[PDB]
Symmetry: C3
């Protein structure tokens, strides 16, 4: 199963690794929030990001590309 990447807002990016985890990166050069999944919609993830104020403030090929050179916060 090829992972799904999505854009959130103007600079935000998400990687759904159906590894069973989600990686959210608010903007270039900030950070990555790593969440384990048991699967929320893209719209539900966008609200959660804002509600939990996720603004910074061995995982798979796709998550390593997105989150390489930035700190990882496992939540």
């Amino acid at each position: 199963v090829t992972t799904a990447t999505f854009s959130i807002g103007s600079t935000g990016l998400v990687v759904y690794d159906y590894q069973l985890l989600i990686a959210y990166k608010p903007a270039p050069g900030t950070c990555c929030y790593i969440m384990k999944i048991a699967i929320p919609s893209l719209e539900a993830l966008t609200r959660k990001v804002h509600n939990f104020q996720m603004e910074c403030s061995f995982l798979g090929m796709a998550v390593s590309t997105l989150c390489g050179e930035v700190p990882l916060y496992y939540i």
Copy 2:
């Protein structure tokens, strides 16, 4: 399952599901999803799909994991 996601315009998002041979397009958050079937021999480039979206006036006026993530909570229109 072999799929790919892309951006279109200011807010548009697209999912190409090469296995199921379908395309899901969402013009913006909270709007709708257009589901299209594709012929196995004529998968359209991103440019071709951008023109098709304009030509069909896709302005919102079973499926895989990636399509369900994109289109959860909005109405689906088959074209």
Copy 3:
């Protein structure tokens, strides 16, 4: 397997880990930059964004790469 990301306002990238190549398109109807990558040193999205900006790559194959780059010239760099 493959992964797609956005760079700036209109830029799009396809990472093709199976064919060990990167396809960057700076805007619709421009061109695609095709780059070869070493399996032991795949560049991060951060590093590719810098490569794209520093070399001013403004245009002056698998399923996902063909979809992104169909209809525009390819520059192998």
